[PDB]
Amino acid sequence: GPHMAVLCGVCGIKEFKYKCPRCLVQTCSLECSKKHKTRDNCSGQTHD
Ligand SMILES: [Zn+2]
Ligand SMILES: [Zn+2]
């Protein structure tokens, strides 16, 4: 690949696969998606 990839906004050690509708954080997995929720107060429903 041409190395045109974005890193996980949370852990940033491989790549992203998700993108929180609120935080817009491109997470690598649901684990990183649920990671910001417990500290940033997020549910991930866009208008939660
Ligand atoms: Zn991650
Ligand atoms: Zn979020």
From Swiss-Prot:
Compartments in which it is found: Nucleus
Domain of life according to the entry: Eukaryota
Binding site for Zn(2+) 1: 8, 11, 28, 32
Residues in HIT-type zinc fingers: 8-42
Residue sites binding Zn(2+) 2 per the record: 20, 23, 36, 42
Note: Present with 2800 molecules/cell in log phase SD medium.
Function: Required for box C/D snoRNAs accumulation involved in snoRNA processing, snoRNA transport to the nucleolus and ribosome biogenesis.
Family membership: Belongs to the BCD1 family.
Protein name: Box C/D snoRNA protein 1
Residue range from the parent sequence: 1 to 45 of 366
